[PDB]
Amino acid sequence: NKNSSYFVEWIPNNVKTAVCDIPPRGLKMSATFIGNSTAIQELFKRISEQFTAMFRRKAFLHWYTGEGMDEMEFTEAESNMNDLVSEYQQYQDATADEQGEFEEEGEEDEA
Amino acid sequence: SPGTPGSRSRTPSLPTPPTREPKKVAVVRTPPKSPSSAKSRLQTAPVPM
Structure with missing residues (x-):
């Protein structure tokens, strides 16, 4: 929403979410991003x-x-x-x- | 194209995606099967003298 200028508008709704039940060890939450860009x-x-x-x-x-x-x-x-x-x-x-x-x-x- | 002496860069640029093409797509196809009917009736009781 805030940054629609940074997302390929002829690929609508550009995200794939996955969510594991289990944290990495020593912290209660984390995340990893993959990013395909013309940049x-x-x-x-x-x-x-x-x-x-x-x-x-x-x-x-x-x-x-x-x-x-x-x-x-x-x-x-x-x-x-x-x-x-x-x-x-x-x-x-x-x-x-x-x-x-x-x-x-x-x-x-x-x- | 004219330019600098010796080896020059080797660049292709043919864009892969299809252009504008004949797919208009949005046309009326199947209206629901719909017949009109004018209808009539005629009252038919016993009619002696």
Whole structure:
């Protein structure tokens, strides 16, 4: 209620509750939270940022391809990370929309 | 796209969720089965002379 701006509005009522009868030892009550958020992208951005700045100069790259790692397999590991950030960003700032008769339909002409 | 010399970042961005699509969904389908009836009656007692 107080913070509806912090919850994905095309995932209505975003919570899964579980409740055990038994406390952790030495305290009469506690709780643990798990949190799936688009706000995590800033991890993967920075790692990718540090990775590309490293990789543009190939800094210490030789130790990985010394182990017979492939420098092309390593190149495309960036792409998965970039695709992952786009996986958050397609749901970032994204909105409810109307249902309707939203089919495309061309002109009354022979093609 | 033009840019800096050497290796450049490798970014896909194809959004997964379906767009607007033909599912209007809310249409009238099954009204309850309802017949009107006009009705009539005619009084029929004994009518001698």
